[PDB]
C-alpha cells in the first residue's frame, strides 16, 4: 500500500481499533441483527452506548458529580451562540480572552446577543502566545469569562487555566479536550466538537455545571436551552447515534492505553519530535508560536519564503502526507497531531523535513 | 440465525447494500487509506461525496435549479425554530395546518417568535384525517403556510398538496421524503431529518427556494449562512452525509422515486389488507382516505390484547411495533428500506395471532 500519514486538522485520524470494532459490528450490533445506525435511541442497546460514553468521559476526565455531560448537534459553532443565549442576560457582559480566530468567532456571536468585552488579547501580535493571566480585565457584571484552550489555527495552547471566582469560566476545548488531565471544577462549562480528539463529526460534547444551566431561560427556543437537554439526558430529539457510538469506541481506546495521563505522555513525545526538528533547522523552519505557548495538538510553521512553503507542501503531498497545508486564513504549514495520530507519522514528518532542508 | 424484522420508527432500517458498502470501505475510502470519518471536510475527497449527495437528491426528486439543498445538524426539531426565526418577520403570521403531534410541536416553536394561526386542524377528531383544502383559513400577511406531509404518530398522510399562491408552502416531510415523486415547485421549503427514508440520524435535509431566503439572527441559525457556504460553513456531519449518498445510490439503482413508490404501495397494501380482512380484530386509526404509506397505526379490540400481540411480535423478532406513547396501540413503520418480506412476515403473524385468539 502507498504510504499515508494523516495530519488532517478536523475531522482527523481516529484510533484504528475504534474503526475496526465499528466495521466488524456495522451490520449486527449487540446481537440485534441491526446496525447501531438502525436502532431506536430508546432501545436498550443504544441506551447502554449513550450511558457508557458518558461514564467513560466522567472516569477519564474525573468529572465531578455536580456536572452533567451533554451530547448535542451543531458543532462548537452552535455553542458560540447557545452559550450567550443562555447566560448573557440583560445587564451582564460576555467577557472573552482572544487567543486566535476561533476566539474571535465566539466573541462575534455573543456581540449579536448582548454586551461583550475583551479581557485580554494577543491579536496585535498575530496570536503568537497566550496572555499572562495578570493582564485579564474582569468586570463585576461578567456573565462568564470565555477562553479557547487550544487555538487550532495559530498553534498555541494554554499551559494551565486561570482561577476565576467572580463568574464562570467557559472554554472551547475543541482541539485539545482529553489530550491531558484536566481539573474540570475550574470551569462552569467546557465544550468541544468531537472531530479532533474524541470521535467523528456530528456530535459536540458539552460538560456543564448543572446548577448554572439547568433553569429555563424565558424566550429561548426549546432546542436552544441547555435545560432541555439536561432534563432529557440529551435525548430530547433524535441524537446522532452513530457519532455517539464512535465517541464511545474512541473513549474505550483512550482508557485502554492508560487514560489522560498516558495520552499526555504520548502527545508530549510526538510533539517534541516535530518541535525538535524545527528548532534544529537553523531557521529553515520557523514556528509561529512562542515557545512557552506551543500547542501539543497543532504545530504551525513556515519556511523562509512562500515559494519554499509551496515546494515543501507539494513534496509532502507527493510523499503521502495529508492535511499539512495551513488554514486558509494564515497560510504556511500545520501538522495536526491529535491523540490518535501515530508516533511513526511524526517520525516520517521529521524525516521529510530533514531531507527537504538538506536537498534545498 | 435469529429472524429480525425492523419496524423502527426513527432511526430506522437502512438498505443492506448501503450498509454493506459502508462496511467494506470503512477503513479505506476511495483508496485514500482513511475512513470517510477521518477526512477533512475541506478535502476534495469529502467535497466530492457532499456534492454527490446533493446531486442525487436533485436528480431523484427532480429539484429545480432555483432551489438549494442544505445539509444541517439539529434534526427536524431545530427546523421548527429556525424556520420562523428566518421567515416570521414583524407584522406577518406563521400559519399552520395541524394534522398530528409533530404539527403541534412546530407551531409551538413559532409561537415563541411571532404571531401564529391555525389554518385548519383535525385535532378535535384525534387526527384521523387530512383536512379538506377548501377549509383552509389563510391570511394576506401569512409569512408561510406550514404542513406536516406524513403524521408519523397518527398514521395519516397528504395524498396531494394544496396550491398555495399567497405565501410559501413549507412542509415537514421527515417521515415520507423521497418515498414517492414530488412536485417540488409546489413548495417554498421542504425539510426532513434523514433517519427515516434518507440515512442515519445526524443530518437534516432542507430544500429551499433560493429567493425565499436576517438582521440579528445568529450566524449558524441563518439559512443564508448555509446557502452561501454550500453547507460547509462549519464542519458537517460527514459520515451521515456519506451514508445519505449511499442510500440515494440504492434508490437510484432500483429505478428512482416511481420504483420506490410502487414498492411502498405494495408493502402498505399487505398490512392494510390484513387489517381490513380481519372482521374488526385489527382496526386502523386513520380514515381510509388519509392512510399513510409510511406508518401504519392500529389497535386490537382491548388493551390486554394489544399488549399480548405486541409481546408475541417481540418474541418472534419484530422490533419497533409499539405505538407512540402518546397514543398507544401499534405502529408498523414501513419506510423505504423496510423490505416487503418483513411486511409479509407481519401479516402472517397477525393472521396467526387472530386465529389463536
Ligand atoms: C474546528 C473548531 C471549531 C469549530 O467547530 P465546528 O464543529 O466546525 O463548528 C471551534 N473551535 C475550535 C477551537 C476549533 O478547532
Ligand atoms: C421524528 C420526526 C420529527 C423530529 O425529528 P428529530 O430529528 O428527532 O428532531 C419531526 N417531524 C416528524 C414528522 C417526525 O416524524
Ligand atoms: Cl485559532
Ligand atoms: Cl481549524
Ligand atoms: Cl404526528
Ligand atoms: Cl414519531
Ligand atoms: Mg477497555
Ligand atoms: Mg505504524
Ligand atoms: Mg389517525
Ligand atoms: Mg383485496
Q: Which class does domain B16-254 fall in?
A: alpha beta
Residue A292: is it exposed, middle or buried by C-beta count within 10 angstroms (0-12/13-18/19+)?
Answer: exposed
Please answer whether residues A240 and A73 qualify as being in contact, where contact means their C-beta atoms are separated by less than 8 angstroms: yes
Using alpha carbons, list the distances in angstroms from residue B307 to A42, B301, B322, B328: 19, 11, 9, 10
* Atom 10 (ligand 1) nearest CA: A76
> Residue A33 carries which DSSP code?
S
Is residue A232 classed as helix, strand or coil in its secondary structure?
coil
> Residue A112 carries which DSSP code?
T
Strands B67-72 and B204-209: antiparallel
The residue to which cell 399552520 is assigned = B96
Concatenating the DSSP letter of every residue in A275-289 gives HHHHHTTTTSSEESS
Give the whole-angstrom CA distance, residue A3 versus residue A233: 43
Q: Give the dihedral sign, CA A186/A191/A195/A196.
A: negative
CB contact under 8 A, B37 and A246: yes
Q: Which residues of A touch B220 (CB under 8 A)?
A: 74-75, 77-78, 80-81, 109
Residues paired with residue B147 on neighbouring β-strands, in sequence order: B171
Residue B341: is it exposed, middle or buried by C-beta count within 10 angstroms (0-12/13-18/19+)?
Answer: exposed
Contacts for A291 with CB less than 8 Å, ≥ 6 apart: none
Chain A nearest CA to B81, separation (Å): 7
Q: Give the dihedral sign, CA A64/A69/A75/A77.
A: negative
The residue to which cell 445506525 is assigned = A37
- Cell reading at B291: 392512510
CB contact under 8 A, B39 and A11: yes
Contacts for B277 with CB less than 8 Å, ≥ 6 apart: none
Closest CA to B292 of B153, B95, B157, B92: B157
- The closest CB to that of A323, out of B40, B233, B234, belongs to B40
Chain A nearest CA to B237, separation (Å): 4
How many C-beta atoms lie closer than 10 Å to residue A219's C-beta? Answer: 8
> Residue A325 carries which DSSP code?
B
Give the whole-angstrom CA distance, residue B153 versus residue A214: 30
Is residue A323 classed as helix, strand or coil in its secondary structure?
coil
- Out of 3.40.640.10, 3.90.1010.10, 2.60.40.10, 3.30.70.890, the CATH code matching A16-257 is 3.40.640.10
Contacts for B344 with CB less than 8 Å, ≥ 6 apart: B270
Give the whole-angstrom CA distance, residue B267 versus residue A55: 42
Cα B193 to middle of ligand 2, angstroms: 6
Please answer whether residues B179 and B197 qualify as being in contact, where contact means their C-beta atoms are separated by less than 8 angstroms: yes
| Cα first-last separation, chain A | 28
Query: To 10 degrees, the CA torsion angle through B4, B9, B15, B18?
Result: -120
Angle in degrees, CA B351, B159, B55, rounded to 5? 105
Cis omega (within 30 of 0) for bond into A152: no
SS (H, E, C) A290-315: CHHHECCCEEEEECCCHHHHHHHHHH
Give the whole-angstrom CA distance, residue B10 versus residue B317: 18
Closest CA to A177 of A140, A148, A136, A138: A148
Give the whole-angstrom CA distance, residue B141 versus residue B91: 7
Give the whole-angstrom CA distance, residue B191 versus residue B200: 15
CB contact under 8 A, B219 and A81: yes
Contacts for B291 with CB less than 8 Å, ≥ 6 apart: B155, B156, B157, B268, B272, B284
CATH code at A258-360: 3.90.1150.10
> Residue A339 carries which DSSP code?
T
Please answer whether residues B189 and B208 qualify as being in contact, where contact means their C-beta atoms are separated by less than 8 angstroms: yes
Give the whole-angstrom CA distance, residue B282 versus residue B236: 44
Round the CA-based radius of gyration of chain A to a whole number and report it: 21
Give the whole-angstrom CA distance, residue A276 versus residue B222: 45
SS (H, E, C) A160-210: CCCCCCCCCEEEECCCCCCCCCCCHHHCCEEEEECCCCCCCCCCEEEEEEH
Using alpha carbons, list the distances in angstroms from residue B344 to A103, B16, B338, B348: 57, 18, 11, 6
The helix (H) or strand (E) run that includes residue A25 is: none
Cis omega (within 30 of 0) for bond into A11: yes
Closest CA to A223 of B76, B88, B207: B76
Residue B138: φ, ψ to 5°: -110, 155
Alpha helices by DSSP H, chain A: 16-24, 44-61, 75-87, 101-111, 210-213, 226-231, 241-256, 259-279, 306-318, 343-359
Q: Which residues of A touch B23 (CB under 8 A)?
A: 23, 26-27
Residue B10: is it exposed, middle or buried by C-beta count within 10 angstroms (0-12/13-18/19+)?
Answer: buried
Q: Give the dihedral sign, CA B97/B103/B104/B106.
A: negative
Please answer whether residues B211 and B66 qualify as being in contact, where contact means their C-beta atoms are separated by less than 8 angstroms: yes
Q: Which residues of A touch B239 (CB under 8 A)?
A: 200-202, 242-243, 246
Give the whole-angstrom CA distance, residue A278 versus residue A295: 14
Give yes or no for residue A174 CB within 6 A of ligand 1. yes
Q: Which residues of B touch A326 (CB under 8 A)?
A: none
Closest CA to B116 of B158, B162, B152, B80: B80
CATH code at B255-357: 3.90.1150.10
Residues paired with residue A71 on neighbouring β-strands, in sequence order: A205
Give yes or no for residue B234 CB within 6 A of ligand 1. yes
Residue B250 a catalytic site member: no
Is residue A240 classed as helix, strand or coil in its secondary structure?
coil
Give the whole-angstrom CA distance, residue A211 versus residue B341: 51
The residue count for chain A:
360
Is residue A258 classed as helix, strand or coil in its secondary structure?
coil
Please answer whether residues A97 and A131 qualify as being in contact, where contact means their C-beta atoms are separated by less than 8 angstroms: yes
Closest CA to B336 of B255, B281, B238: B255
Residue B191: φ, ψ to 5°: -140, 155
- Cell reading at B295: 406508518
Residue B108 a catalytic site member: no
Give the whole-angstrom CA distance, residue B289 versus residue A151: 59
Cα A99 to middle of ligand 3, angstroms: 7
Residues paired with residue B146 on neighbouring β-strands, in sequence order: B96, B170
The residue to which cell 451582564 is assigned = A92
Give the whole-angstrom CA distance, residue B111 versus residue B97: 14
Give the whole-angstrom CA distance, residue B214 versus residue B269: 46
SS (H, E, C) chain B: CCCCEECCCCCCCCCHHHHHHHHHCCCCHHHCCCCHHHCCCCCHHHHHHHHHHHHHHHHHHCCCCCEEEEEECCHHHHHHHHHHHHHCCCCCEEEEEECCHHHHHHHHHHHHHCEEEEEEECHHHCCCCCCCHHHCCCCCCEEEEEEECEECCCCEECCCCCCCCCCCEEEECCCCCCCCCCCHHHCCEEEEECCCCCCCCCCEEEEEEHHHCCCCCCHHHCHHHHHHCCCCCCCCCHHHHHHHHHHHHHHHHHCCHHHHHHHHHHHHHHHHHHHHCCCCCCEECCCHHHECCCEEEEECCCHHHHHHHHHHHHHCCEECCECCCCCCCEEEECCCCCCHHHHHHHHHHHHHHHHCC
The residue to which cell 472531530 is assigned = A195
Query: To 10 degrees, the CA torsion angle through B320, B322, B324, B326?
Result: -160
Cα B273 to middle of ligand 10, angstroms: 6
Cα A152 to middle of ligand 4, angstroms: 5
Give yes or no for residue B235 CB within 6 A of ligand 1. yes
Q: How was this structure determined?
A: X-ray
Pocket-forming residues, ligand 2, beta carbon under 6 Å: A 237-238; B 10, 75-77, 102, 148, 152, 172, 174-175, 193
Nearest CA in chain A to B193: A238
> Residue A32 carries which DSSP code?
S
Nearest CA in chain A to B12: A38
Can you give the residue ranges of every domain in chain B?
16-254, 255-357
Nearest CA in chain B to A4: B33
- Cell reading at A234: 440529551
Query: To 10 degrees, the CA torsion angle through A219, A223, A224, A230?
Result: 110
What resolution (Å)?
1.1
Nearest CA in chain B to A323: B40
- Cell reading at B163: 396550491
Give the whole-angstrom CA distance, residue B135 versus residue B41: 47
User: In angstroms, how far apart are the furthest CA atoms of chain B?
Assistant: 65
Angle in degrees, CA A63, A64, A68, rounded to 5? 75
The residue count for chain B:
357
Give the whole-angstrom CA distance, residue B264 versus residue B155: 14
How many C-beta atoms lie closer than 10 Å to residue A293's C-beta? Answer: 21
* Atom 2 (ligand 1) nearest CA: A174
Please answer whether residues A205 and A65 qualify as being in contact, where contact means their C-beta atoms are separated by less than 8 angstroms: no
Chain A nearest CA to B66, separation (Å): 27
Contacts for A311 with CB less than 8 Å, ≥ 6 apart: A356
- The closest CB to that of A81, out of B33, B200, B220, belongs to B220
Residues paired with residue B295 on neighbouring β-strands, in sequence order: B333
Is residue A158 classed as helix, strand or coil in its secondary structure?
coil
Please answer whether residues A222 and A88 qualify as being in contact, where contact means their C-beta atoms are separated by less than 8 angstroms: no
Chain A nearest CA to B13, separation (Å): 5
Angle in degrees, CA A57, A61, A62, rounded to 5? 105
Q: Which residues of A touch B78 (CB under 8 A)?
A: 73-74, 223, 237
- The Cβ-side half-sphere exposure at A260, using a 13 Å CA radius, reads 18
Give the whole-angstrom CA distance, residue A228 versus residue B342: 37
Contacts for B293 with CB less than 8 Å, ≥ 6 apart: B157, B176, B179, B180, B264, B265, B267, B268, B334
The helix (H) or strand (E) run that includes residue A148 is: strand A142-148
Give the whole-angstrom CA distance, residue A95 versus residue A87: 12
Is residue A341 classed as helix, strand or coil in its secondary structure?
coil
Residue B14: φ, ψ to 5°: -115, 160
- The closest CB to that of B38, out of A12, A35, A219, belongs to A12
Give the whole-angstrom CA distance, residue A26 versus residue B68: 32
Quick one: residue B64, left, alpha or beta (phi over 0 = left, psi -120 to 50 = alpha)?
A: beta
Catalytic residues of A: 102, 172, 196
Query: To 10 degrees, the CA torsion angle through B171, B173, B177, B182?
Result: -20
- The Cβ-side half-sphere exposure at B181, using a 13 Å CA radius, reads 7
Please answer whether residues B46 and B39 qualify as being in contact, where contact means their C-beta atoms are separated by less than 8 angstroms: yes
Amino acid at each position: 500500500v502507498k504510504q499515508v500519514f494523516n495530519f488532517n486538522a478536523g475531522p482527523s485520524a481516529l484510533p484504528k481499533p475504534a474503526l475496526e470494532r465499528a466495521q466488524k459490528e456495522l451490520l449486527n450490533f449487540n446481537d440485534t441483527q441491526m446496525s447501531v445506525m438502525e436502532l431506536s435511541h430508546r432501545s436498550q442497546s443504544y441506551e447502554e452506548v449513550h450511558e457508557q460514553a458518558q461514564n467513560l468521559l466522567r472516569e477519564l476526565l474525573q468529572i465531578p458529580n455536580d456536572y452533567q455531560i451533554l451530547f448535542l448537534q451543531g458543532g462548537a459553532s452552535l455553542q458560540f451562540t447557545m452559550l450567550p443565549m443562555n447566560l448573557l442576560t440583560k445587564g451582564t457582559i460576555g467577557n472573552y480572552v482572544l487567543t486566535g480566530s476561533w476566539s474571535e468567532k465566539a466573541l462575534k456571536e455573543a456581540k449579536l446577543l448582548g454586551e461583550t468585552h475583551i479581557a485580554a488579547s494577543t491579536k496585535a501580535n498575530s496570536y503568537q502566545s497566550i496572555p499572562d493571566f495578570s493582564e485579564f480585565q474582569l468586570n463585576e457584571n461578567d456573565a462568564y469569562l470565555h477562553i479557547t484552550s487550544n487555538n487550532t489555527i495559530y498553534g498555541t495552547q494554554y499551559q494551565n487555566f486561570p482561577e476565576i471566582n467572580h463568574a464562570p469560566l467557559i472554554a472551547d476545548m475543541s482541539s485539545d479536550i482529553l489530550s491531558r488531565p484536566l481539573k474540570v471544577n475550574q470551569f462552569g462549562m467546557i465544550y468541544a466538537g468531537a472531530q479532533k480528539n474524541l470521535g467523528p463529526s456530528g456530535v459536540t460534547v458539552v460538560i456543564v455545571k448543572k446548577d448554572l444551566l439547568n433553569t429555563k431561560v424565558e424566550q429561548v427556543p426549546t432546542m436552544l436551552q441547555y435545560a432541555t437537554h439536561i432534563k432529557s439526558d440529551s435525548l430530547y430529539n433524535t441524537p446522532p447515534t452513530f457519532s455517539i457510538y464512535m465517541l464511545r469506541n474512541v473513549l474505550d481506546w483512550i482508557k485502554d492505553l492508560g487514560g489522560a495521563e498516558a495520552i499526555a505522555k504520548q502527545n508530549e513525545e510526538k510533539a517534541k519530535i516535530i518541535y525538535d526538528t524545527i528548532d534544529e533547522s537553523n531557521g529553515f523552519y520557523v514556528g509561529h508560536a512562542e515557545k512557552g505557548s506551543r500547542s501539543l495538538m497543532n504545530v504551525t510553521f513556515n519556511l523562509r519564503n512562500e515559494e519554499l512553503n509551496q515546494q515543501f507542501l507539494a513534496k509532502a503531498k507527493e510523499q503521502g502526507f495529508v492535511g499539512l497545508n495551513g488554514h486558509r486564513s494564515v497560510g504556511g504549514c500545520r501538522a495536526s497531531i491529535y491523540n490518535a495520530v501515530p508516533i511513526d507519522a511524526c517520525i516520517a514528518l521529521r524525516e521529510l523535513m530533514i531531507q527537504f532542508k538538506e536537498n534545498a
